[PDB]
Ligand SMILES: O[C@@H]1[C@@H](O)[C@@H](O)CO[C@H]1O
Ligand SMILES: O[C@@H]1[C@@H](O)[C@@H](O)CO[C@H]1O
Protein backbone atom coordinates (compact mmCIF):
# COMPACT_ATOMS: atom_id res chain seq x y z
CA UNK A 1 0.00 0.00 0.00
CA UNK A 2 1.11 3.66 -0.41
CA UNK A 3 3.21 5.14 2.45
CA UNK A 4 4.68 8.56 3.40
CA UNK A 5 1.43 10.60 3.61
CA UNK A 6 1.24 11.76 7.28
CA UNK A 7 4.71 11.19 8.81
CA UNK A 8 3.93 7.46 9.26
CA UNK A 9 6.74 4.86 9.19
CA UNK A 10 7.66 4.17 5.55
CA UNK A 11 8.28 0.48 6.33
CA UNK A 12 7.31 -1.65 9.34
CA UNK A 13 8.47 -5.21 8.44
CA UNK A 14 12.07 -4.26 9.27
CA UNK A 15 13.55 -1.48 11.41
CA UNK A 16 15.29 1.24 9.40
CA UNK A 17 17.46 4.25 10.25
CA UNK A 18 19.76 6.97 8.97
CA UNK A 19 18.03 7.39 5.59
CA UNK A 20 20.06 8.60 2.58
CA UNK A 21 17.61 9.42 -0.20
CA UNK A 22 18.56 9.86 -3.89
CA UNK A 23 16.74 10.22 -7.18
CA UNK A 24 18.06 7.60 -9.65
CA UNK A 25 16.19 6.50 -12.82
CA UNK A 26 13.27 8.76 -11.88
CA UNK A 27 12.65 6.91 -8.58
CA UNK A 28 13.55 7.68 -4.99
CA UNK A 29 16.12 5.17 -3.72
CA UNK A 30 16.73 5.17 0.03
CA UNK A 31 19.89 3.76 1.63
CA UNK A 32 19.23 3.36 5.37
CA UNK A 33 20.80 1.33 8.16
CA UNK A 34 18.98 -1.93 8.89
CA UNK A 35 18.34 -1.95 12.65
CA UNK A 36 18.14 -5.29 14.46
CA UNK A 37 17.42 -6.23 18.07
CA UNK A 38 20.95 -7.40 18.91
CA UNK A 39 20.34 -6.71 22.62
CA UNK A 40 23.96 -5.58 23.08
CA UNK A 41 24.88 -3.21 25.96
CA UNK A 42 23.53 0.36 25.45
CA UNK A 43 26.15 3.04 26.11
CA UNK A 44 27.59 6.31 24.82
CA UNK A 45 29.98 4.40 22.48
CA UNK A 46 26.99 3.09 20.45
CA UNK A 47 27.49 -0.65 21.14
CA UNK A 48 23.68 -1.05 21.02
CA UNK A 49 23.88 -0.37 17.23
CA UNK A 50 25.11 -3.78 15.99
CA UNK A 51 23.72 -3.83 12.47
CA UNK A 52 24.92 -6.51 10.05
CA UNK A 53 23.51 -5.72 6.58
CA UNK A 54 21.89 -3.13 4.29
CA UNK A 55 18.61 -3.23 2.37
CA UNK A 56 17.93 -0.74 -0.44
CA UNK A 57 14.42 0.77 -0.51
CA UNK A 58 12.69 2.49 -3.41
CA UNK A 59 9.59 4.58 -4.11
CA UNK A 60 8.13 5.68 -7.45
CA UNK A 61 6.13 8.48 -5.78
CA UNK A 62 5.80 10.20 -2.38
CA UNK A 63 3.52 9.02 -0.94
CA UNK A 64 3.95 5.61 -2.56
CA UNK A 65 4.49 1.89 -2.22
CA UNK A 66 7.95 1.20 -0.74
CA UNK A 67 9.90 -1.68 -2.30
CA UNK A 68 12.46 -3.59 -0.18
CA UNK A 69 15.08 -4.98 -2.60
CA UNK A 70 16.41 -7.59 -0.10
CA UNK A 71 19.94 -7.77 1.30
CA UNK A 72 22.17 -5.45 -0.75
CA UNK A 73 25.32 -6.09 1.32
CA UNK A 74 26.05 -8.42 4.25
CA UNK A 75 28.90 -7.84 6.74
CA UNK A 76 29.97 -11.50 6.33
CA UNK A 77 30.98 -10.69 2.72
CA UNK A 78 32.97 -7.52 3.56
CA UNK A 79 36.54 -8.88 3.90
CA UNK A 80 37.94 -5.99 5.99
CA UNK A 81 34.95 -5.49 8.33
CA UNK A 82 34.83 -6.61 11.99
CA UNK A 83 31.48 -5.24 13.19
CA UNK A 84 28.80 -2.54 13.00
CA UNK A 85 27.34 -1.44 9.66
CA UNK A 86 26.29 2.14 10.37
CA UNK A 87 24.73 5.01 8.34
CA UNK A 88 25.39 4.48 4.59
CA UNK A 89 25.01 6.48 1.38
CA UNK A 90 25.08 5.88 -2.38
CA UNK A 91 26.23 7.58 -5.56
CA UNK A 92 25.81 7.06 -9.29
CA UNK A 93 28.49 7.66 -11.93
CA UNK A 94 28.71 6.47 -15.58
CA UNK A 95 26.17 3.65 -15.17
CA UNK A 96 27.73 2.25 -11.97
CA UNK A 97 26.35 2.56 -8.45
CA UNK A 98 28.47 2.86 -5.31
CA UNK A 99 27.34 2.09 -1.77
CA UNK A 100 29.45 3.91 0.84
CA UNK A 101 29.34 2.52 4.34
CA UNK A 102 31.02 3.01 7.74
CA UNK A 103 32.14 -0.08 9.65
CA UNK A 104 34.72 -1.06 12.24
CA UNK A 105 37.69 -3.00 10.90
CA UNK A 106 39.16 -6.00 12.76
CA UNK A 107 41.09 -3.60 15.05
CA UNK A 108 37.75 -1.97 16.09
CA UNK A 109 38.52 1.25 14.17
CA UNK A 110 35.78 2.80 12.01
CA UNK A 111 36.64 3.22 8.34
CA UNK A 112 34.54 3.89 5.26
CA UNK A 113 34.29 1.30 2.48
CA UNK A 114 32.68 1.16 -0.94
CA UNK A 115 30.67 -1.54 -2.69
CA UNK A 116 29.84 -1.54 -6.41
CA UNK A 117 26.80 -2.53 -8.48
CA UNK A 118 25.30 -2.08 -11.94
CA UNK A 119 21.90 -1.21 -10.35
CA UNK A 120 20.74 1.41 -7.81
CA UNK A 121 18.86 -1.45 -6.07
CA UNK A 122 22.06 -3.50 -5.62
CA UNK A 123 23.20 -5.97 -4.58
CA UNK A 124 26.75 -4.59 -4.24
CA UNK A 125 30.21 -6.19 -4.34
CA UNK A 126 32.42 -4.68 -1.59
CA UNK A 127 36.02 -3.63 -2.19
CA UNK A 128 38.38 -5.83 -0.18
CA UNK A 129 39.84 -2.89 1.81
CA UNK A 130 38.28 0.35 3.11
CA UNK A 131 38.94 3.67 1.39
CA UNK A 132 42.57 4.70 1.93
CA UNK A 133 42.68 7.66 4.32
CA UNK A 134 39.05 7.30 5.45
CA UNK A 135 38.07 7.12 9.09
CA UNK A 136 35.07 7.62 11.38
CA UNK A 137 31.47 7.35 10.17
CA UNK A 138 28.41 8.69 8.34
CA UNK A 139 29.53 9.29 4.75
CA UNK A 140 27.51 11.53 2.45
CA UNK A 141 28.71 11.47 -1.15
CA UNK A 142 27.54 14.64 -2.88
CA UNK A 143 27.53 15.22 -6.65
CA UNK A 144 27.99 18.92 -7.38
CA UNK A 145 26.52 20.57 -10.54
CA UNK A 146 29.99 20.65 -12.13
CA UNK A 147 30.17 16.81 -11.99
CA UNK A 148 32.64 16.63 -9.08
CA UNK A 149 31.82 14.24 -6.23
CA UNK A 150 32.74 14.92 -2.58
CA UNK A 151 32.56 12.73 0.51
CA UNK A 152 31.48 14.45 3.71
CA UNK A 153 32.07 12.32 6.81
CA UNK A 154 32.64 12.09 10.55
CA UNK A 155 31.01 11.40 13.87
CA UNK A 156 32.26 12.19 17.39
CA UNK A 157 31.84 10.07 20.56
CA UNK A 158 31.32 6.47 19.27
CA UNK A 159 32.10 7.58 15.71
CA UNK A 160 35.73 8.13 16.83
CA UNK A 161 36.34 11.38 14.86
CA UNK A 162 37.96 12.92 17.95
CA UNK A 163 40.67 10.19 17.78
CA UNK A 164 41.90 11.21 14.29
CA UNK A 165 43.44 14.69 14.81
CA UNK A 166 46.92 13.63 13.52
CA UNK A 167 45.73 11.56 10.53
CA UNK A 168 46.32 8.36 12.54
CA UNK A 169 44.11 6.68 15.14
CA UNK A 170 44.96 7.83 18.69
CA UNK A 171 43.98 4.45 20.23
CA UNK A 172 41.08 2.95 22.19
CA UNK A 173 42.12 4.73 25.42
CA UNK A 174 41.89 8.16 23.68
CA UNK A 175 38.94 10.60 24.06
CA UNK A 176 35.48 9.01 24.26
CA UNK A 177 33.79 12.32 23.31
CA UNK A 178 35.55 15.29 21.68
CA UNK A 179 38.66 17.51 22.17
CA UNK A 180 37.65 18.16 25.82
CA UNK A 181 38.38 21.90 25.33
CA UNK A 182 34.96 23.56 25.31
CA UNK A 183 36.41 27.05 24.64
CA UNK A 184 38.31 25.90 21.52
CA UNK A 185 36.51 25.57 18.17
CA UNK A 186 34.37 22.43 17.99
CA UNK A 187 35.54 19.52 15.86
CA UNK A 188 34.42 19.95 12.24
CA UNK A 189 33.20 17.33 9.75
CA UNK A 190 35.53 16.04 7.04
CA UNK A 191 35.53 16.43 3.26
CA UNK A 192 37.45 14.93 0.36
CA UNK A 193 36.99 15.14 -3.39
CA UNK A 194 36.44 11.65 -4.80
CA UNK A 195 38.72 10.00 -7.35
CA UNK A 196 37.44 9.65 -10.93
CA UNK A 197 36.77 5.92 -10.32
CA UNK A 198 34.87 6.63 -7.05
CA UNK A 199 36.97 4.16 -4.98
CA UNK A 200 39.37 6.59 -3.27
CA UNK A 201 40.00 10.20 -2.26
CA UNK A 202 41.58 12.56 -4.80
CA UNK A 203 43.17 14.87 -2.17
CA UNK A 204 44.21 15.01 1.47
CA UNK A 205 41.14 15.04 3.74
CA UNK A 206 40.09 18.56 4.85
CA UNK A 207 38.22 19.70 7.97
CA UNK A 208 35.20 21.97 7.53
CA UNK A 209 34.91 25.23 9.53
CA UNK A 210 31.49 26.04 10.95
CA UNK A 211 30.97 29.57 12.27
CA UNK A 212 28.16 31.59 13.88
CA UNK A 213 26.46 34.66 12.27
CA UNK A 214 29.33 36.87 13.59
CA UNK A 215 31.92 34.69 11.81
CA UNK A 216 33.27 33.18 15.04
CA UNK A 217 33.91 29.42 15.27
CA UNK A 218 31.21 27.28 16.85
CA UNK A 219 32.79 26.19 20.14
CA UNK A 220 33.14 22.72 21.63
CA UNK A 221 30.88 23.63 24.57
CA UNK A 222 28.09 24.76 22.24
CA UNK A 223 26.32 21.38 22.05
CA UNK A 224 23.12 22.93 20.61
CA UNK A 225 24.96 23.93 17.42
CA UNK A 226 28.22 21.98 17.10
CA UNK A 227 28.74 19.06 14.70
CA UNK A 228 28.14 15.59 16.12
CA UNK A 229 27.36 13.25 13.18
CA UNK A 230 25.15 12.68 10.08
CA UNK A 231 26.67 15.27 7.71
CA UNK A 232 24.63 15.90 4.55
CA UNK A 233 25.09 18.29 1.64
CA UNK A 234 22.51 19.75 -0.73
CA UNK A 235 22.34 22.85 -2.89
CA UNK A 236 19.56 25.40 -3.27
CA UNK A 237 19.71 28.63 -5.31
CA UNK A 238 23.49 28.12 -5.79
CA UNK A 239 24.10 28.00 -2.01
CA UNK A 240 25.65 24.98 -0.30
CA UNK A 241 23.75 23.59 2.71
CA UNK A 242 25.71 21.55 5.25
CA UNK A 243 23.21 19.86 7.55
CA UNK A 244 23.97 17.54 10.46
CA UNK A 245 22.97 16.03 13.77
CA UNK A 246 24.02 17.66 17.06
CA UNK A 247 23.80 14.29 18.88
CA UNK A 248 23.33 14.84 22.62
CA UNK A 249 21.05 17.86 21.98
CA UNK A 250 19.09 15.86 19.37
CA UNK A 251 18.71 18.45 16.56
CA UNK A 252 19.23 18.38 12.84
CA UNK A 253 20.67 21.81 12.07
CA UNK A 254 22.06 23.53 8.98
CA UNK A 255 24.73 25.96 7.93
CA UNK A 256 25.25 27.67 4.56
CA UNK A 257 28.29 28.44 2.41
CA UNK A 258 29.40 29.32 -1.12
CA UNK A 259 31.49 26.22 -1.99
CA UNK A 260 31.81 22.51 -0.96
CA UNK A 261 34.62 23.11 1.56
CA UNK A 262 32.95 25.99 3.45
CA UNK A 263 33.24 27.73 5.79
CA UNK A 264 29.55 27.32 6.63
CA UNK A 265 27.57 29.81 8.71
CA UNK A 266 25.14 28.25 11.19
CA UNK A 267 21.58 29.26 10.26
CA UNK A 268 19.16 27.22 12.36
CA UNK A 269 17.26 24.02 13.09
CA UNK A 270 16.00 21.66 10.34
CA UNK A 271 14.42 19.05 12.62
CA UNK A 272 13.62 19.20 16.32
CA UNK A 273 14.18 16.17 18.57
CA UNK A 274 12.39 12.91 17.75
CA UNK A 275 11.38 9.87 19.81
CA UNK A 276 14.63 8.05 20.62
CA UNK A 277 18.11 9.50 21.25
CA UNK A 278 19.42 9.62 17.66
CA UNK A 279 18.38 11.99 14.89
CA UNK A 280 19.61 11.34 11.33
CA UNK A 281 18.36 12.59 8.01
CA UNK A 282 18.76 13.45 4.37
CA UNK A 283 17.33 16.19 2.16
CA UNK A 284 16.38 15.50 -1.49
CA UNK A 285 14.47 17.17 -4.34
CA UNK A 286 11.97 14.96 -6.22
CA UNK A 287 9.44 16.21 -8.79
CA UNK A 288 10.21 19.82 -7.81
CA UNK A 289 9.46 19.34 -4.08
CA UNK A 290 12.02 19.05 -1.31
CA UNK A 291 11.78 16.25 1.25
CA UNK A 292 13.33 15.56 4.62
CA UNK A 293 13.90 11.86 5.22
CA UNK A 294 14.49 11.11 8.91
CA UNK A 295 13.89 8.47 11.60
CA UNK A 296 12.53 7.90 15.07
CA UNK A 297 11.97 5.11 17.61
CA UNK A 298 8.15 5.32 17.41
CA UNK A 299 7.50 1.86 15.88
CA UNK A 300 9.55 0.01 18.53
CA UNK A 301 7.90 1.95 21.40
CA UNK A 302 10.99 4.09 22.06
CA UNK A 303 13.91 1.64 21.81
CA UNK A 304 17.01 3.65 20.81
CA UNK A 305 18.38 0.98 18.46
CA UNK A 306 15.10 -0.03 16.74
CA UNK A 307 14.14 2.88 14.53
CA UNK A 308 11.88 3.53 11.55
CA UNK A 309 12.33 5.97 8.68
CA UNK A 310 9.80 8.68 7.85
CA UNK A 311 9.50 11.50 5.34
CA UNK A 312 8.01 15.00 5.28
CA UNK A 313 8.05 17.99 2.92
CA UNK A 314 10.78 20.58 3.56
CA UNK A 315 10.25 24.27 2.73
CA UNK A 316 13.02 26.63 1.65
CA UNK A 317 12.25 30.33 1.67
CA UNK A 318 13.52 32.40 -1.28
CA UNK A 319 16.14 34.02 0.98
CA UNK A 320 17.69 30.57 1.52
CA UNK A 321 16.39 29.97 5.07
CA UNK A 322 14.55 26.72 5.79
CA UNK A 323 11.40 26.33 7.89
CA UNK A 324 12.07 24.29 11.03
CA UNK A 325 10.19 20.97 11.16
CA UNK A 326 8.84 19.75 14.51
CA UNK A 327 8.07 16.03 14.15
CA UNK A 328 4.82 15.58 16.14
CA UNK A 329 2.76 18.74 15.65
CA UNK A 330 0.42 18.29 12.65
O1 LIG B 1 25.88 6.01 11.93
C1 LIG B 1 24.65 6.15 12.64
C2 LIG B 1 24.74 7.32 13.63
O2 LIG B 1 24.73 8.57 12.92
C3 LIG B 1 23.59 7.27 14.62
O3 LIG B 1 22.36 7.73 14.00
C4 LIG B 1 23.45 5.85 15.15
O4 LIG B 1 23.20 4.90 14.10
C5 LIG B 1 24.33 4.79 13.26
O5 LIG B 1 24.05 3.86 12.20
O1 LIG C 1 28.37 7.66 20.63
C1 LIG C 1 27.32 7.06 19.86
C2 LIG C 1 27.35 7.63 18.45
O2 LIG C 1 28.55 7.22 17.80
C3 LIG C 1 26.12 7.17 17.67
O3 LIG C 1 26.18 5.77 17.45
C4 LIG C 1 24.84 7.52 18.44
O4 LIG C 1 24.88 6.94 19.75
C5 LIG C 1 25.99 7.36 20.55
O5 LIG C 1 25.98 6.66 21.79
Ligand SMILES: [Ca+2]
Pocket residue numbers: 018019020087088089138139140230231232281
Ligand atom coordinates in the same frame (compact mmCIF):
# COMPACT_ATOMS: atom_id res chain seq x y z
CA1 LIG D 1 23.91 10.01 6.49
Ligand code: NA
Pocket residue numbers: 268269322323324
Ligand atom coordinates in the same frame (compact mmCIF):
# COMPACT_ATOMS: atom_id res chain seq x y z
NA1 NA E 1 14.17 28.03 12.21
